[PDB]
Amino acid sequence: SGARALEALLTVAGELRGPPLQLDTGQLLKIAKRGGVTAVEAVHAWRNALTGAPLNLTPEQVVAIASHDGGKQALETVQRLLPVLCQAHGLTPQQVVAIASHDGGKQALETVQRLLPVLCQAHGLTPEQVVAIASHDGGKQALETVQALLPVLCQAHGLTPEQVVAIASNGGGKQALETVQRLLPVLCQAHGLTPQQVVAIASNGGGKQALETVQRLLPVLCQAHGLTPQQVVAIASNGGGKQALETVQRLLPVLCQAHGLTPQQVVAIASNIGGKQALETVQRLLPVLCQAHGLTPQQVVAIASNGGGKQALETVQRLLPVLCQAHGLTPQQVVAIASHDGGKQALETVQRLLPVLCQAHGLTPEQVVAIASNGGGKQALETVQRLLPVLCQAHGLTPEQVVAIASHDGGKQALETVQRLLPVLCQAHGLTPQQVVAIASNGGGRPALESIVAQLSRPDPALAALTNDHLVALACLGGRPALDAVKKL
DNA sequence: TGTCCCTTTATCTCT
DNA sequence: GAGAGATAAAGGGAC
């Protein structure tokens, strides 16, 4: 009955493509791959209840919840617990989705429910801090561990609640927490690290192995390799962790002696998530990129030194000719696009969309490069392609303004939020569009605009002190953080 | 056969 | 630009 079971499964997928979820093939694939057949079936059985009152989940939220080991249990649990978490604990549905959307989401949900009161009332955490702790695989473990260990970590060890939250808020947060508890004294007292440096190391995924590996290799990397404790700390706390540290141990001589890299640029390469992969890839590709592509070593190092640098390097090697000779991009432009986290996605997206953006939207190659040369470049490019025409027709923006909003980290968010909040800002708050554009055209433009609309609607006397124009100027180069900075004085 | 937890790597967003 | 936070995905081990 394998063929009938298969027919049943495909009928289920087909039905999900209809109401109420209207899932696309990508979404189906996501749930299948990450949550399995049981998650696909669970979504199908509960589609009405997940999208209906009292949950009202969007299809994207349903997809995010299902797309994990135990996805079925998470979906089941969200149906039981969301009304209490929202109405009793004061969480928003999106915060609930965030707690739910990990392997073991059911456990983290039951645990936020049980623990949020003690964490906030007795330990002094905010609900947002509790959400951040919960929103990872093993969230239950981290929540219980913070609850158990925050008092010892703060009083006996001197850490702030914020620092404990930082350590706890990664996958394996429990491991990281216990390892800080164990290893904070040695690393400070014996190695002379500050507590903040230890927190900075501990607050990445694999924080525990990173701490243990800093203890293990700090002396040999300094002594036998010539690095400073600072460099070792940067390598350990920049996401590279244990893998990066050990790979620097192995490859530093070869990269310096044979390939001619300074130890500083080797450190720059090691100092991101996937630093091990980046190091190995520079070792492999430095000759080829520097003899048969005329890229300088500086340029290669610059590409390698971001998270997933490996991917960026291989992608540069593959696409540099096509982008230079077919799309008319200069190698410097290709380097600039490559030299961010996710440079691979940005490059591939430029290869795909450059012609479209130049010819259907009239953008010059320089503008396309401008948009592409930030983290999340792919996202920004795709949402300019989507929203350029509507923002010009409906909201009366120029292509320049659209490119400007787009050309920062989070450009996608800033564009979408302009689309969502431009009407009410200008209509109900006699706010000007050039003004809203001004707010949107920085990193954090999104939360800036949102804090603005929050102020105008449910204002806050304390903050209710500046002009619909003074707050504008404030958001315009401090954003949300500036708005909060004033609104606590 | 799934569920839960942890590490590593890749990508995106904000301070 | 750098540091940091956050979301996603893979792959592994334990029951």
Residue numbers in the entry: 233 to 721
Q: What wording appears in the published article?
A:
Transcription activator-like (TAL) effectors specifically bind to double stranded (ds) DNA through a central domain of tandem repeats. The crystal structures of TAL effector (TALE) proteins bound to their respective target DNAs have revealed that the residue at position 13 is the only one directly involved in DNA base recognition, whereas the 12th residue stabilizes the proper loop conformation. dHax3, an engineered TALE protein, proved to be a useful scaffold for structural characterizations.
As a proof-of-principle, we generated two dHax3 variants, dHax3-NI, in which Ile34 was introduced at repeat 7 to replace Ser34 for recognition of base A, and dTALE (standing for designed TALE repeats), in which the RVDs in repeats 3–12 were replaced and the protein recognize an artificial DNA element (5′-TCCAACTACTAGA-3′). Two structures were determined for DNA-bound dHax3-NI at 2.8 Å and 2.2 Å, respectively. In contrast, the structural difference between the high-resolution structure of DNA-bound dHax3-NI and the other DNA-bound TALE structures is a combination of both axial compression and rotational tightening of the TALE repeats accompanied by a slight distortion of the DNA duplex. Despite the prominent conformational changes between the overall structures, when the individual repeats of the high and low-resolution structures of DNA-bound dHax3-NI are superimposed, the RMSD value is 0.23 Å over 30 Cα atoms of the second repeat.
